[PDB]
Amino acid sequence: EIPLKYGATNEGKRQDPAMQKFRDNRLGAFIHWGLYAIPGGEWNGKVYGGAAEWLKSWAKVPADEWLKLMDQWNPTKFDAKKWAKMAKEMGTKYVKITTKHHEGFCLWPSKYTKYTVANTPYKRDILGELVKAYNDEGIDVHFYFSVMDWSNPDYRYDIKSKEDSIAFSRFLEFTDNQLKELATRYPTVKDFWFDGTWDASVKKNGWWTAHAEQMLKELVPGVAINSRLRADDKGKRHFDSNGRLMGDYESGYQRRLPDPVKDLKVTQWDWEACMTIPENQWGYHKDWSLSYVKTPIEVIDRIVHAVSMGGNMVVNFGPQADGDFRPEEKAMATAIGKWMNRYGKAVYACDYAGFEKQDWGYYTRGKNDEVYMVVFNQPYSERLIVKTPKGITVEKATLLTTGEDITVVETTRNEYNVSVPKKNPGEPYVIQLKVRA
């Protein structure tokens, strides 16, 4: 059992009220908004297929050039109340915002750098207005923060000389300063979601990542901290050298989700997936025809998937340069909200139900031991196979929307056929089971 000073802190899942709230929220939205939204995946006449928020890299734009985009930052359509209404209508319970992405441009007016919203034509504290607006709607706010900072000349990818170490130490102090500022300026913050912490420079300073977590937990009662931040004494990331999870929840899943049959280990900790609507675009890219774009049903499936295996799911948005959302994102939020309004009882405050996975879709467990069947794949047999854990019976099945009673037939030991509804709902639907132990 390797000794470590900067490994895991939490034993199992936190069950203080703040973490229960983080968990029970379940469905979140992500905001990627920064200077990259201006060029929108395109530099000086050449469109790049890579992720838009990383365009500075793909086009090899020097920091001094990249940051002049600040002079163009003027989102006249921006309206925080509207953003928050969109999120309320979508059924999102929390929103994660990029405070500062790799590019280093801050969405709040930081004291520790000129590269902020303050020194743009728009001037205003975007982050502050979002915090206020989402909170007004009863919506928690989480802070995405990139440790890697392409606008700070003290950042290092590795520590190779005395000179590197001098610069990076000062950079860690700079970073500390920004984090402390975020924490005291916006004390309703409920989560810090770190990114750009993979570089050798960070791995060699695991102590700093443990310090970062502890500092923020001291300034912000019950704040959550993602695993992506954390490196142990040896530079093992996410999970320490003893296989123990660091931070408060796992945050490696994006693009992929854990297998509902093979990866039930995820149910032993809190975790959160974040996903993009196209294949790999977080910030606004002007040309969505470049890769596969997920449909609403596809996204809702990933949402229910995550919850059925005891995880959060967060749907990304990359707002336009003008401060409005592309119509594909508006339709996504609207379609999701319509579904959530009919079926959210099976998502909010639900968890892993402990049943074997079946082809028609996913189970979730409600807080009062309700067991929802969420059907994405409608069997031609007109029967939904339910195999119960040892000790468990099905007493009733009810179509959530109508309250209509659903036929349950015992087929064998620990197994039932639950009938499809008499009329096909025509969309992914929920059947709620009443169970006895």
What is the enclosing helix (H) or strand (E) of 397?
Answer: strand 393-399
Q: Which residue is nearest to ligand FUF (CB)?
A: 195
Q: Going residue by residue from 248 to 287, which x/- string records binding to ligand FUF, judged by CB under 6 A? A: --------------------------x-------x-----
422, exposed or middle or buried, with CB in 10 Å at 0-12, 13-18, 19+? exposed
CB of 380 to ligand FUF, least distance (A): 40
Cβ proximity to ligand FUF, 212 vs 274, nearer residue: 274
Residues in contact with ligand FUF, total (CB under 6 A)? 6
Interacting span for ligand FUF (CB under 6 A) from 48-56, 172-180, 260-268, 287-295:
48-56
Q: Which residues of 82-91 are buried (b: 16+ CB within 10 A; e: fewer)?
A: ebbebbbbbb
Binding piece for ligand FUF, criterion CB under 6 A, among 49-57, 104-112, 182-190, 237-245: 49-57
**Among the residue ranges 13-21, 47-55, 64-72, 82-90, the one whose residues contact ligand FUF (CB under 6 A):** 47-55
CA neighbours within 13 Å on the CB side: how many for 145? 26
Chain-centre distance for alpha carbon 261: 23
Q: How far is the CB of 9 from ligand FUF (least distance, A)?
A: 23
CB nearer to ligand FUF: give 51 or 321: 51
Measured from the CB atom, the residue of 51 and 80 that comes closer to ligand FUF is 51
What is the per-residue burial (b if ≥16 Cβ within 10 Å, else e) of 251-261? Answer: bebbeebbebe
Q: Is the separation of the CB atoms in 210 and 230 below 8 Å? A: yes
Query: Shortest approach of ligand FUF to residue 155 CB, angstroms?
Result: 15
Which one, 317 or 355, has the nearer CB to ligand FUF?
317
**If we measure between CA atoms, which residue out of 329, 417, 322, 312 comes closest to residue 93?**
312
Q: Are 97 and 31 in contact (CB under 8 A)?
A: yes
Restricted to residues 166-195, the positions that interact with ligand FUF (CB under 6 A) are 195
Q: How far is the CB of 249 from ligand FUF (least distance, A)?
A: 15
- Please give the helix or strand (H or E) that residue 271 lies within, else none: strand 271-275
Please report, as residue ranges, which positions from 280 to 319 form the binding site for ligand FUF (by CB under 6 A). 282
Phi/psi zone of residue 62: left (φ > 0), alpha (ψ -120 to 50 degrees), beta? beta
Q: Within positions 217 to 236, which residues make up the interface with ligand FUF, using CB under 6 A?
A: none
3-state secondary structure of 116: strand
Backbone angles phi, psi at 216, to 5 degrees: -70, -35
The one among 51, 182, 307, 315 contacting ligand FUF by CB under 6 A: 51
Cα 297 from Cα 315, distance rounded (Å): 13
Cα 420 from Cα 403, distance rounded (Å): 14
Residue 139 CA, chain-centre distance (Å), reads: 14
Stretch that binds ligand FUF, among 46-54, 72-80, 152-160, 385-393 (CB under 6 A): 46-54
* C-alpha closest to that of 316 among 290, 277, 273: 277
Helices 80-90 and 126-136, packing angle to 10 deg: 40
Binder among 14, 53, 69, 408 for ligand FUF (CB under 6 A): 53
192/355 with CB nearer ligand FUF: 192
- Give min distance, CB of 47 to ligand FUF, in A: 18
Task: Report the residue number, 56 or 365, with the smaller CB distance to ligand FUF.
Answer: 56
Q: Which CB atom, from 156 or from 285, has the smaller least distance to ligand FUF?
A: 285
Nearer to ligand FUF, 54 or 134 (CB): 54
* Least distance in angstroms from the C-beta of 51 to ligand FUF: 6
Residues that bind ligand FUF (CB under 6 A): 51, 53-54, 195, 274, 282
